[PDB]
């Protein structure tokens, strides 16, 4: 038979090619790294305080359907925005997997491994922007200044991207309020041993990921680690 462009009737080459198997190995390391980064959260037999979905019975299932629509929007990116997502997650994982050449070797091949590590290593030493509650309005206005610059690529030319968007359906965005309002309280009502492990790891996170030998950026991070945990990668438009 000849190709499907002339005088055929069904789509062919339904076979596991090289690029599908390359996507298949990379999805499986994504289910291993996210397994291993959840091991620090659930380290004993019980689920921790921050592995929670929601509070309302309709809101716990709305966390998945938002996140299932969130992972479609990373797939729905443009070809320039996919390639800038490709190499920037390569760069932020060598800073993550620092001292090993073997751990540096694996991320340069597998591309969804790079998104899996630097999202989970942010949530292993809890340097996320959700898990930190600043102790005062001195640290809060330092934390509220930096993330608005991190929101400045949600609109790159004054028009919004899809990556900053949180409403996907009718009445969707109100669950996205109360899931983070409860996450702000549970971070505030976390244990006293964990929150000072948060500030020291986040001020160690910002000095190696964004300062790079700068005395001024290390000094504000050691004064305000809440602003250090709001600092993220620029591949995330939000």
Ligand X SMILES: *[C@@H](C)C1=C(C)C(=O)N[C@H]1Cc1[nH]c(/C=C2\N=C(C[C@H]3NC(=O)C(CC)=C3C)C(C)=C2CCC(=O)O)c(CCC(=O)O)c1C
* 117: contact with ligand PEB by CB under 6 A: yes
DSSP symbol at 169? S
Please list, in sequence order, all residues whose beta carbon lies within 8 angstroms of the beta carbon of residue 207, skipping any fewer than 6 positions away.
217, 218, 221, 222, 228
Short-list 167, 165, 142, CA closest to 154: 165
Looking at beta carbons only, is 92 or 232 nearer to ligand X? 232
Q: Min. distance of Cβ 101 from ligand X in angstroms? A: 37
From 6-14, 34-42, 74-82, 194-202, give the range in contact with ligand PEB by CB under 6 A. 34-42
Q: Which does 93 bind (CB under 5 to 8 A by kind): ligand PEB, ligand X, another protein, none?
A: none
Task: Please say which residue, 117 or 203, places its beta carbon nearer to ligand PEB.
Answer: 117
**Which residues does a gap of C–N over 2.5 Å follow in the chain?**
none
Binding residues for another protein, rule: CB under 8 A, are 61, 65, 72, 75-76, 78, 95, 98-99, 137-138, 140-142, 144, 155-160, 162, 164-170, 172-173, 192-193, 195-196, 199-200, 204, 207-208, 213-216, 218-219, 222-223
If the CB atoms of residues 109 and 156 are measured against another protein, the closer one turns out to be 156
Helix (H, G, I), strand (E, B) or coil at 128: coil
CB of 9 or CB of 102, closer to ligand PEB: 102
How many whole angstroms separate alpha carbon 31 and alpha carbon 160? 31
CA atoms within 13 A of residue 122's CA, in its CB half-sphere: 21
* 3 binding ligand PEB? (CB under 6 A): no
* Selected range binding ligand X among 15-23, 35-43, 59-67, 174-182, rule: CB under 6 A: 174-182
- Whether the CB-CB separation of 231 and 210 falls below 8 Å is answered with yes
Of positions 34, 69, 81, 222, contacts ligand PEB by CB under 6 A:
34
- Looking at the Cβ atoms of 35 and 191, the one nearer to another protein is 191
Question: Is residue 201 close enough to count as binding ligand PEB by CB under 6 A?
Answer: no
DSSP labels, 47-95:
--TTS---SSHHHHHHHHHHHHHHHHHHHT--HHHHHHHHHHHHHHHHT
**If binding is defined by CB under 6 A, does position 151 make contact with ligand X?**
yes
**How many residues bind to ligand PEB according to rule CB under 6 A?**
46
**Region binding ligand X by CB under 6 A among candidate stretches 16-24, 106-114, 172-180, 210-218:** 172-180
């Amino acid at each position: 038979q000849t190709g499907l462009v002339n005088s055929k009737f069904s789509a062919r080459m339904a076979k596991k090619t090289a690029k599908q198997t390359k996507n298949k190995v990379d999805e499986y390391m994504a289910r291993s790294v996210q397994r291993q980064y959840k091991q620090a959260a659930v380290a004993t037999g019980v689920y921790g305080t921050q592995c929670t979905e929601g509070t309302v019975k309709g809101a716990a299932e709305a966390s998945r359907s938002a996140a299932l629509s969130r992972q479609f929007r990373i797939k729905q990116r443009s070809a320039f925005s996919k390639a800038h997502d490709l190499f920037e997650f390569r760069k932020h994982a060598i800073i993550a997997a620092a001292g090993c050449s073997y751990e540096e070797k694996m991320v340069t091949r597998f591309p969804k491994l790079a998104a899996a590590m630097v999202l989970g290593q942010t949530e292993m030493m809890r340097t996320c922007s959700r898990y930190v509650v600043p102790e005062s309005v001195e640290e809060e206005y330092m934390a509220a200044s930096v993330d608005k610059q991190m929101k400045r690529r949600g609109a790159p030319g004054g028009v919004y991207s899809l990556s900053c968007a949180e409403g996907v359906a009718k009445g969707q965005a109100e669950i996205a309020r109360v899931s983070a309002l409860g996450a702000a309280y549970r971070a505030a009502s976390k244990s006293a041993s964990a929150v000072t492990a948060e500030r020291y790891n986040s001020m160690a996170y910002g000095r190696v990921h964004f300062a790079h030998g700068c005395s001024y950026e290390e000094q504000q991070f050691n004064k305000y680690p809440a602003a250090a945990a709001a600092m993220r990668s620029d591949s995330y438009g939000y």
